[PDB]
Structure 1
Amino acid sequence: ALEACPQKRGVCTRVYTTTPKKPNSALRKVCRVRLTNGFEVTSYIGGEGHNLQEHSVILIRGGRVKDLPGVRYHTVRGALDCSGVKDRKQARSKYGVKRPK
């Protein structure tokens, strides 16, 4: 976070997929982000589906992914272009998903 700030914005450079380590196997969704801090780190994309393109621009939280060595940050869904998960009945507090009527 550099300035030790809770959150930091950044423009995505590429929204590619990565595979877990030895004990796991899947297609975890990540994306390189150029935070305003001047650093280009990779953040994980929580949820079963996102809508992040090339000019996504999403706020970074900060969390290490035991599966993906390097991804020490998590994306905050529900802020900016990062649309919250759809039909999220459970984790709405996270991923940012308004309670259906």
Structure 2
Amino acid sequence: PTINQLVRKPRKSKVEKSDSPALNKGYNSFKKTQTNVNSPQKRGVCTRVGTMTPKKPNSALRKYARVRLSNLIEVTAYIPGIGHNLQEHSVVLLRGGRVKDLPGVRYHIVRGALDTAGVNDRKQSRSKYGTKRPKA
């Protein structure tokens, strides 16, 4: 546009979004207040754990667990690794990361880091999945 127009026009931008809102709590104590808390994780209680089915063209039975974050917002997360110990009423941590072959979940918990037990067999990439090195 003519320079005189931008003089009399702001010429704004298109501020971006976030990929994990529940990690920036909409505060709740004592008086239910606003957000500055962009943590790298939070925690919650497993309100129920089950399996669900993905979308085409994949095929599996993904294992998930619905949780309730401390900041009073509901979230349905995912659990990695082969097998687990999660059941109803269990505290666990939440690590931010999306999973695409399944819709509705954009967080998944971290293995071994809390009440949840680490995977019990892996021998190659035990950093993730929280498995302590085998010392025979």
Q: TM-score of the superposition, structure 1-length normalised?
A: 0.94
| Runs of 5+ unmatched residues, structure 1 | none
Alignment partner for residue 19 of structure 1, among 37, 53, 72? 53
Q: CA deviation at 1:91?
A: 2.4
Residue 20 of structure 2 is matched in structure 1 by none
Letter in 2 for 1:97: T
Gaps of 5+ in 2: 1-22, 25-36
Corresponding residue of 1:43 = 77
Q: Number of paired residues?
A: 101
Match of 1:85 in 2: 119
| TM-score, normalising length: structure 2 | 0.71
Task: Output one character per residue of 1:20-68: Cα deviation in whole Å (capped at 9) or x when no partner.
Answer: 1111111111111101121111111100111001012110001111111
Over aligned residues, Cα RMSD in angstroms? 0.9
How far off its partner does 1:12 sit? 0.6
CA distance in 2, matches of 1:13, 1:52: 10
> Could you say which structure has the higher helix fraction?
2
Question: Larger radius of gyration, structure 1 or 2?
Answer: 2
